[PDB]
Amino acid sequence: SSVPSQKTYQGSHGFRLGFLHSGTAKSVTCTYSPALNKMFCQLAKTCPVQLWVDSTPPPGTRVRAMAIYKQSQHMTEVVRRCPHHERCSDSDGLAPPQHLIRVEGNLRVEYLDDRNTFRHSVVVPYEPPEVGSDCTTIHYNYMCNSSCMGGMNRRPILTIITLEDSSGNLLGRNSFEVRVCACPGRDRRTEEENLRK
Numbered sequence: 001s002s003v004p005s006q007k008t009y010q011g012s013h014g015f016r017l018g019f020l021h022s023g024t025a026k027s028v029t030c031t032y033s034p035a036l037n038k039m040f041c042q043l044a045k046t047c048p049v050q051l052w053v054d055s056t057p058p059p060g061t062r063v064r065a066m067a068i069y070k071q072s073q074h075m076t077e078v079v080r081r082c083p084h085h086e087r088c089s090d091s092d093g094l095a096p097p098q099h100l101i102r103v104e105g106n107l108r109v110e111y112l113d114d115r116n117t118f119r120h121s122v123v124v125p126y127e128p129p130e131v132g133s134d135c136t137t138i139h140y141n142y143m144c145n146s147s148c149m150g151g152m153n154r155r156p157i158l159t160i161i162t163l164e165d166s167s168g169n170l171l172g173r174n175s176f177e178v179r180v181c182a183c184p185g186r187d188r189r190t191e192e193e194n195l196r197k
């Protein structure tokens with residue numbers, strides 16, 4: 001399949017992502033590394049991602065998340081769940097069983113299997129922040145480990161978050177690497193220690 005662009009594009013609304021401050025305790029379930037621009041998370045656990053805008057986009061704006069393989073040799077392959085997890089019957093009633101990325105706690109979620117590129121993505125309406133908040137948080141879940149055989153096969157992925165109009169035109173784009181693993185805290189610490197040493 002054709003490779004969706006990963007180029008950062010803040011756009012006219014100044015679209016940026018934010019992440020909670022987490023540490024590297026071995027018990028942590030999701031932890032973001034600013035140095036690596038990389039989220040480390042466990043399978044099927046909440047991954048909060050904050051949407052920040054400098055100006056409010058118009059009604060009908062949407063927020064799409066899509067995984068792509070980070071390495072050039074794998075970029076043209078659609079990111080999918082492994083057959084074992086696809087068949088394990090763990091859906092929430094809406095997410096197709098093959099989709100890696102789910103959204104939890106959103107009544108207006110839509111799951112797309114692109115009719116032409118076969119890529120999967122998950123989209124929700126953009127909602128402005130509520131009273132007292134400065135950003136909007138989406139709760140993602142990743143439904144396979146990076147190591148799953150027949151799925152990610154130990155290959156790193158990026159998540160691309162796009163702000164789009166109702167018709168799919170690009171308003172903004174950001175991305176971050178993801179590792180889905182048993183012990184995100186240890187893996188983040190190891191990768192950061194390797195980076196800094």
Ligand SMILES: [Zn+2]
Pocket residue numbers: 081082084085086143144145148149151
């Ligand atoms: Zn799997």
